[PDB]
Amino acid sequence: KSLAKRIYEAYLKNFNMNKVKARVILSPPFVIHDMETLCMAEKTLVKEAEVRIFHCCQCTSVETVTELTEFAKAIPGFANLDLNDQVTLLKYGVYEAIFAMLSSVMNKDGMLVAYGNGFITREFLKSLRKPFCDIMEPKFDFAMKFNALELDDSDISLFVAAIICCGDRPGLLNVGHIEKMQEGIVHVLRLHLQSNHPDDIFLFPKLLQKMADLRQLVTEHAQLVQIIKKTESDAALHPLLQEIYRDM
């Protein structure tokens, strides 16, 4: 199906980091396993260590939104939608996509950061004071079960495309058409999963469960976000991310 080929190529063009790239790397990355190694990484690769780390998260968040936006625009049909719908889908979709794609750079030990040249451990993140330690853990939890599906980039591209073109985001104008868009993408995905993962012909419905879990993961994230907004002064939230979260 040509739709699979376009989305995949759009995803390779638009996402600087992808799974095969991240796996080749994890197969020489710098390891932030402690403060001493944190500071060293802040010398080369990119105020409390905690809020520093947080700020780095926001930077990465913003870059990925930009890339998701550009990826969206390259999805057949997307640019032909009304603007308020292009905005709506992105608004409600970026964080599900972000956390789905975050899985590609996480193993049980930690996650790649600084465009791949850094690696921050899961443990070191958990050692952090509250609530900042509660930020990455649920994402690591999601990632482990997600990576267990062993999707590749050709799968993930379609999965992210489906997250984005989602007929049930609140406030859509042309729902009928967006439903059909999603149907077409979901269709490509299912068949693609059937040819690319014959060993689990029910991998498709499992990914639908993943979608549900992403919606719940993100909801919980926004709450922790709202907590950190009200706890820590010195942890300012980037106005772009703040706009994304507004009335979400």
Ligand SMILES: CC(C)(Oc1ccc(CCOc2ccc(/N=N/c3ccccc3)cc2)cc1)C(=O)O
């Ligand atoms: C508030 C915010 C930003 O929440 C999020 C938190 C995490 C993520 C996923 C990406 O997370 C990262 C965490 C740490 C990173 N550190 N990189 C370095 C580099 C050098 C030195 C120290 C750390 C990078 C990514 C997404 C969102 C949100 O709601 O957007």
